[PDB]
Amino acid sequence: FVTYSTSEPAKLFGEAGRRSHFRARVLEATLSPLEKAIFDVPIEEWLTVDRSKFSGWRCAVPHPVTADELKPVDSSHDILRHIALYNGPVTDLQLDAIVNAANKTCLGGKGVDGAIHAAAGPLLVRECATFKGCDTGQCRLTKGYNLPARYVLHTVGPIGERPEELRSCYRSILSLAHRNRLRSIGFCCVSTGVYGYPLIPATRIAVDETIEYLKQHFSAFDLCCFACFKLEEYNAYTDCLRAWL
């Protein structure tokens, strides 16, 4: 078997040119009047506008899930009344923001990242192309475009099992949402999955940081929802929350 269509290169060198070239093509593309109208809404204004007034805006989710439909893990508990689990994709959630597990370029990728870009539509990556990427453990904020949610919080988790970098992601998301007075957030499972942060330790950290933030800042959030696409993820949160209790 031959396994490549030409001679092998001198060594591995390709990658960063593709991404800069993609970023360049995204920035250079001509937006329609429909798209431009949506794209120019100032970011802070997007929270509250009526998005149906733009013919370019087509909600990507047929039946979005609103905050009133998300039951907390314990309505009696002073902290855990602000926490809910959703057994489905984070893109269903019509909240102030959802979290995207991004990479340093913020230009899309596999997994939840690709799902979010696909639901939000082409303007999401256009907004991401305009800023200088995202560092590991930090968070960027954009509009959510065709998402039911208003904003996306793009964070960059660690590749491996680096507890202090993943902690930082949760800290950055929570502080940035709070700074902008966003009151409901839908999380995805940052850094988990194939070759990533093992599920239970990751979930431990997510739960621990989010509860610590809620304890220390009474007035910050109405709801933090952990969207758990897979049943395994849902059960990890359930166990960690029960183990936290």
User: Of 54, 67, 72, 122, which one interacts with a copy of itself (CB under 8 A)?
Assistant: 122
Q: How far apart are CA 225 and CA 93, in angstroms?
A: 9
Residue from 55, 66, 71, 131 in contact with a copy of itself (CB under 8 A): 131
Residue 133: CB atoms within 10 Å: 18
Supply φ then ψ for residue 211, to 5 degrees.
-65, -40
Report d(CA 144, CA 212) in Å as an integer: 27
Taking CB under 8 A as the rule, does residue 108 contact a copy of itself? yes
Minimum CB distance to a copy of itself, residue 184 (Å)? 16
Give the interface segment with a copy of itself, choosing from 48-56, 92-100, 118-126, 208-216 (CB under 8 A).
Answer: 118-126
Residues 3 to 22: which contact a copy of itself by CB under 8 A? Answer: 3-6, 8-9, 11-12, 14-19, 21-22
Q: How many residues bind a copy of itself (CB under 8 A)?
A: 56
Q: Is 94 in the site for a copy of itself (CB under 8 A)?
A: no
Q: For 57, list phi and psi in degrees, rounded to 5.
A: -85, 115
Window 37 to 56, contacts with a copy of itself (CB under 8 A): 43-44
Q: Is 154 helix (H, G, I), strand (E, B) or coil?
A: strand
Q: Which is nearer to a copy of itself, 25 or 77 (CB)?
A: 25
**Is residue 62 near a copy of itself by the rule CB under 8 A?**
no
Rounded to an integer, what distance in angstroms lies between the CA atom of residue 99 and that of residue 120? 13
For the bound state, the minimum distance from the C-beta of residue 183 to a copy of itself, rounded and expressed in Å, comes to: 14
Q: Which of 53, 50, 86 is nearest to 68 (CA)?
A: 86
Write down the residue that tokens 């997510």 correspond to: 206
Q: Which stretch binds a copy of itself (CB under 8 A): 33-41, 84-92, 98-106, 219-227?
A: 98-106
For the bound state, the minimum distance from the C-beta of residue 38 to a copy of itself, rounded and expressed in Å, comes to 15
Q: Is 34 in the site for a copy of itself (CB under 8 A)?
A: no
CB 39 within 8 A of CB 123: yes
Residue 138's Cβ-side half-sphere holds a number of Cα atoms within 13 Å equal to 9
172-231: contacts with a copy of itself (CB under 8 A): 172-173, 175-176, 179-180, 194-195
Tokens of 80: 């855990």
User: What residue has token string 């913020």?
Assistant: 106
Q: Token pair of 94, please?
A: 């019509």
| Alpha-carbon span 59 to 43, nearest angstrom | 18
In the complex, the residues that contact a copy of itself under the rule CB under 8 A are 1-6, 8-9, 11-12, 14-19, 21-22, 25-26, 29, 43-44, 103-105, 108-111, 113-114, 117-118, 122, 125, 131-135, 138-142, 159-160, 172-173, 175-176, 179-180, 194-195
